[PDB]
Design a protein around this ligand. Structure first.
Ligand code: FAD
Ligand code: FAD
Ligand code: FAD
Ligand code: H4V
Ligand code: H4V
Ligand code: TP9
Ligand code: TP9
Ligand code: K
Ligand code: K
Ligand code: MG
Ligand code: MG
Lengths: 593, 593, 215
């Protein structure tokens, strides 16, 4: 009655297949090899889920991340032992830093060969320990259903993140001969008082601000409740890179993105706020600027008993990790918002505060040097063009990126309006993410427009996965901002290393011939007069498509809060300064750059 | 006098640069990023070594491995923190399993940010612990020269292998202000008795055999002394995959490669030998077959005091790990051979033993089904063609491979004659190795012909590095054996899973258009009548070149010792069996395969 | 020996295989092996400017001051010069002469209610070789509210003299972190600190608390 014998007679591989079904897995990303063959044999021609084959297991890993971020379901990876498993390490570290539910199943050499430096043996449980929430090696088939349940549960609860389950070949080839507990075959007053205290604090605030991040995206009602709070108590809203789309940026209350390359208006507002409502965001060091100089008005208000930081956070590890919370509200931010909002006083107007908020927004747009006659397309202009044109299809639009300047310009210059539409490597910052993440997001949302805004260097990292998009039937749209440089690094070299560009110009392939070789449509935009029509052709395509755009080189991302500086101590765009910088760069490089 | 102040006033990055010089580093493989910028600034426009820029840090890692195996020098890698570092994990695990001296320098976030889940922070010391001999995080600039010396020393002594040195950005930006020990600024009777005992054993042997591996390649005199021993005591010689080229395979005493896919003659000989002289080889599980059934005549002879296993091994970990040595001779095999050979009796003839050796060689060639009119090129034939034609240039020829059937056919069908000419991933078996390893080997040996014999799937893994070959001026020769399948896995699926090909057919790009996009010469051989002239064009090219050859599909690598079987219990090629197999495959797949 | 005795002192272990210690050295070895900042300077100046504004200073001294023979001497010199009451941790006991009128005795879970009251009311806390352990701070969010308020208003805060970066900003935010040996850094600090003859209102409170809260 409490024991189940329905799996007796099945191989570990067959049991794996059945547990995928029970966990409602509809997609698996993976790549075969000797140690994992018994599992591949069990899932052979399965009509229970879609299997997606990359060209490299790093591709499978980032695809599964893109899938998970787009769908809100765990991304499932199935790879072989040894190099198949070590190739998923960067995607696991990536998923860990960005809170992405990844369930990685790696084949392993037979238990009889473990520890012998066996053929294709890696200590993946040892290697992946630091880049997973949890991992395990299954030692017998009777415990395989339990370990699969544990993996999915850990991956998806608390702060979501990656887990790894190591599967020795003899375990997955072995047959279950014994019944197993049937439970294994199937998938506070303290906080209540803190919420009340937090509401009393917000009800005193004269300069409140919401600082919202990825955690609000982890409940479907999150963005709705965020809006309900901002509307009720009349509060301006800034988000992190990972929170983009949690708040409708068309709302007058939107302050846009904060941080190192965020709006100087948002950065100014949080530096002057007396009450900061932190909703599912971890105060990472790209956001806070100089920590000792962060949020001085909120710290003063906390000291004077009239404000502070109200931190809604699900992981105790991240409470009081970076900044002291005046009130820590532990648990799912969306559930706790349901308790919080009714205790919060409705506020009709905040004339002095919004007068400041509105002047800062007017004073601090995302300015840059516009095109001039004969100049190359500016990368900021390109992003605006894509954003304006994409918003006109009757389809959801999901954006993935690589890492570098193009990523920041995508963040700044798209207009973000919907949750789970910005899928970008933030904490680890992995170049190469953009293309496989887009394939995974496209598989998750087959009716969406999915656009990978990519850098040339980033794209070079994982371009082989173009074949994977075709083979998977994923009509992704890749836009390579070709500045022929690792722009983010050259930006730092211009600024801090006197224009000494040390190994930051990789040679690029011919992207149009590359696309052709991969059986992907190719478009190349080389001048200002091709921008609008080329972007329309890109978006109108109904097949995978690679758009290359030639863009201005040696252009900094601004605003910028340099290392060591307070959040409100930012560099702003200035036309004359940019001209002088260009002249200095030219002199210093003998006209090379 | 014992203290040195000559580095005072230098940054950690400048100190790094100077220590590279002192360690005679002439090549660095790497890729920039924020945390490692102070080092990149110091090496800016250095004329002291060549810098090689890949498209992906995995590429840098495998390039450095190829470089190290071709040159006998350590391969030096320089990457940034976070994903730059985690991307080198597969190459480190690879180097560890194959005994490759790799010195990996990874940038790290400032010491003030370590442990805070910082921007681009990975616990690379934790993650790489299992896949390095040793690693360290440098905590201050005064210890940086010492840690660099330690890294090179550990990487290159004992069994060579990978090490990692983690470099926090604030350490490499900081300036040395204090003098440091000058030593840090600059780079047995028991065994003697064992050698004598070992010689007395060999002098009794009536059926000796040398089993030689990678360790003999780690001294320039190794192959010479191997030959001197085989000549003096009249002993047949077999090698591992990694020992290929240690012995001139044209010598009548050559038994070729042993093991899972080695010659049935070599496998028969070692199963019947009364004395096995193991020279720098680790009895890995691809070589021994069923361990309990391995070398029964040598074990019997050991018991009867007239033979056994004489193991010349530098790493105590690998002595008596898999098989009991009758005599363990610890230390460098080449140095110990110098002591050993004079104690060994010269033997003019061994009529009965060599009569058996010669009949086995005649009985067990590497047979396969030849081309027939209209058939595709057989992959075995292609390898023979490349080997015959390459051997006719007045240049050294170095071969790298991917992983799979093509790798085994390269091993079997090339004629190996020179040390450090087979550069292949053996222990970990990493698909994608072939191309970057070839670039690294080509940089090490600019006047060599370097041929990457690659599989289509393997090539797909890291094909982006074609641009890197061009940018580095490395005129590598890539031959893709295009069977449009992961052949080694389909071989196992045909044999053990009743022709159920579960996800083992990845779609390929157009390799000729791909080559064009990468600015690489492209050649495509599609039929038997183009084989000779196409291979000549390939070898005659003086620029990087990609040759695609369409080859027969669903062809097994034979001979084969299946899992669980004794080394002399092998499957041999049989024409009629192959015909039946083809018919069965056709029936079972409804004519699809 | 070097690791055990530098930075924050602590234990090390060296494992000695019997065959290594029985074996005989046969080769020569490097002779060195046979024998045994502007940023901080600016922080010290900033810290002194803060203390020179303080109207209710208190020294919170621990074990680190015992790690230099001159430590207690310099602690006394500072307390005397700027006229500051001194409390210590359990591990700092003996760093300050408890017979001195400026002694507040031990603070913490079982420390003097006078010391605990004083640190809760101080506008400037000079933390000298002490790690804010949880036996000392009480409820962390309610710890040192007058010092946190003063930090916010630019007239005080916590000046943390600490040798191990791990223990800086670990528990409580330092207004100024002064990294390195506390005794050496005190030698730079004290000359920048203004001599104070009297603090009538503060010591009036300190003296009433001591009278009110004996053991
Ligand atoms: C080149 C580059 C530049 C960058 N510059 C910026 C910048 O200027 N601005 C910026 O914002 N980012 C920037 N980043 C990204 C930055 O490094 C971080 O990735 C990002 O700020 C983290 O955002 P987050 O805190 O919302 O998300 P996360 O890092 O995912 O943190 C989410 C937090 O919410 C918690 N949480 C999760 N789920 C729940 C739940 N259900 N309930 C409650 N809490 C939950 C988590 O435990 C966690 O503490 C940059 C990245 C790169 C590569
Ligand atoms: C698909 C595939 C099939 C394979 N099938 C086969 C096969 O059929 N046959 C085969 O041989 N391999 C095969 N392999 C490769 C196999 O897995 C191992 O990589 C290989 O056999 C190891 O060879 P080795 O022992 O010579 O080298 P290593 O693994 O490098 O071991 C060298 C040994 O020598 C020692 N050593 C190093 N330097 C010195 C020194 N200076 N003095 C003394 N000792 C030293 C090392 O410590 C070590 O113990 C296959 C690989 C793949 C991917
Ligand atoms: C039953 C019990 C009750 C207790 N109750 C109390 C109590 O009421 N009050 C109390 O104080 N303790 C109490 N403790 C002790 C408490 O747990 C800690 O051990 C103690 O408070 C630590 O004191 P410390 O910070 O001075 O020393 P440590 O823990 O040694 O910390 C010293 C700090 O100074 C730093 N440092 C070291 N050397 C130098 C240097 N040369 N320069 C600069 N910095 C340096 C160290 O890195 C470290 O951060 C109790 C213990 C027990 C068992
Ligand atoms: C992946 O290797 C192992 O899992 C293993 C490792 C050590 C001992 C035994 C084994 S095993 O269970 O027998 N399996 C194999 O060997 N499989 C194998 N598969 C292929 I495809 C190819 C191949 O060899 C090329 N081997
Ligand atoms: C690589 O990041 C770090 O090393 C780090 C991590 C945490 C805190 C401080 C730091 S730091 O020393 O200041 N350096 C940066 O920040 N560098 C940086 N570089 C780029 I190019 C780009 C970039 O931001 C996009 N940052
Ligand atoms: C080298 C580097 N960062 C360090 C680095 C190295 N390696 C990896 C895998 N990831 C990162 N983030 C960057 S952001 C350059 C990105 O160049 P790009 O992709 O052409 O983008 P862009 O030119 O727009 O800045
Ligand atoms: C999937 C696989 N092995 C598992 C595997 C998975 N992933 C990695 C990174 N490495 C390995 N070795 C092989 S050998 C197929 C190789 O196919 P190929 O490169 O086209 O070679 P071939 O067809 O000649 O056998
Ligand atoms: K925007
Ligand atoms: K051969
Ligand atoms: Mg670029
Ligand atoms: Mg193939």
């Amino acid at each position: 009655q409490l024991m189940d014998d329905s799996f007796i007679g099945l191989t570990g591989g067959e049991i794996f297949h059945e547990m995928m079904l029970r966990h409602k897995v509809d997609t698996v990303f993976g790549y075969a090899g000797g140690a994992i063959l018994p599992v591949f044999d069990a899932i052979y021609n399965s009509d229970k889920f879609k299997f997606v084959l990359p060209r490299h297991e790093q591709g499978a890993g980032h695809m599964a991340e893109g899938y998970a971020r787009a769908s809100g379901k765990p991304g499932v990876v199935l790879v072989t032992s040894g190099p198949g498993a070590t190739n998923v390490i960067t995607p696991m570290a990536d998923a860990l830093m960005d809170g992405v539910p990844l369930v990685v199943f790696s084949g392993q050499v037979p238990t009889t060969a473990i520890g012998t430096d066996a053929f294709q043996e890696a200590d993946i449980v040892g290697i992946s320990r630091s880049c997973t929430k949890w991992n395990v090696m299954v030692k017998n088939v009777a415990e395989l259903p339990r370990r699969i349940n544990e993996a999915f549960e850990i991956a998806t609860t608390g702060r979501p993140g990656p887990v790894l389950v190591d599967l020795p070949k003899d375990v997955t080839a072995s047959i279950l001969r014994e019944s197993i507990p049937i439970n294994t075959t199937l998938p506070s007053e303290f906080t209540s008082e803190a919420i009340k205290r937090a509401a009393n604090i917000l009800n005193k605030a004269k300069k409140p601000i919401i600082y919202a991040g990825a955690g609000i995206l982890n409940n479907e009602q999150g963005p709705k409740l965020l809006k309900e709070l901002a509307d009720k108590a009349n509060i301006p809203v800034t988000t992190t890179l990972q929170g983009l789309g949690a708040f409708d940026q068309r709302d007058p209350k939107s302050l846009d993105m904060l941080g190192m390359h965020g709006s100087a208006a948002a950065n100014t507002a949080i530096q002057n706020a007396d009450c900061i409502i932190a909703l599912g965001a971890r105060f990472d060091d790209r956001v806070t600027g100089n920590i000792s100089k962060f949020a001085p008005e909120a710290k003063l208000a906390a000291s004077e008993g009239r404000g502070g930081i109200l931190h809604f956070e699900i992981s105790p590890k991240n409470i009081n990790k970076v900044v002291e919370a005046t009130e820590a509200i532990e648990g799912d931010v969306t559930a706790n918002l349901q308790s919080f909002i009714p205790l919060v006083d409705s506020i009709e107007n905040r004339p002095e505060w919004f007068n400041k908020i509105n002047e800062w927004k007017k004073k601090y747009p995302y300015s840059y040097q516009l095109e001039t006659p004969g100049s190359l397309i500016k990368p900021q202009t390109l992003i605006k063009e894509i954003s304006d044109q994409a918003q006109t299809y009757n389809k959801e639009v999901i954006v993935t990126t690589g890492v570098g300047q193009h990523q920041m310009w995508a963040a700044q210059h798209f207009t973000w309006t919907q949750p789970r539409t910005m899928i970008t490597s933030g904490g680890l910052g992995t170049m190469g993410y953009g293309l496989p993440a887009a394939i995974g997001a496209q598989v998750a949302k087959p009716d969406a427009i999915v656009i990978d805004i990519d850098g040339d260097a980033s794209f070079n990292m994982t371009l082989t996965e173009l074949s994977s998009a075709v083979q998977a039937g994923a009509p992704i749209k890749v836009c390579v901002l070709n500045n022929e440089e690792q722009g983010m690094v050259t930006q730092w070299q211009s600024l801090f290393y006197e224009h000494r560009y040390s190994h930051t110009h990789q040679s690029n392939p011919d992207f149009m011939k590359l696309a052709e070789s991969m059986n992907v449509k190719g478009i190349r935009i080389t001048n200002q007069q091709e921008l609008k029509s080329g972007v329309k052709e890109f978006l109108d395509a109904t097949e995978p498509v690679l758009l290359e755009v030639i863009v201005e080189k040696k252009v900094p991302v601004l605003p910028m809060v340099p290392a060591g500086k307070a959040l409100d101590d930012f560099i702003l765009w200035d036309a004359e300064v940019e001209k002088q910088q260009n002249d200095l760069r030219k002199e210093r490089t003998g006209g090379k750059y």
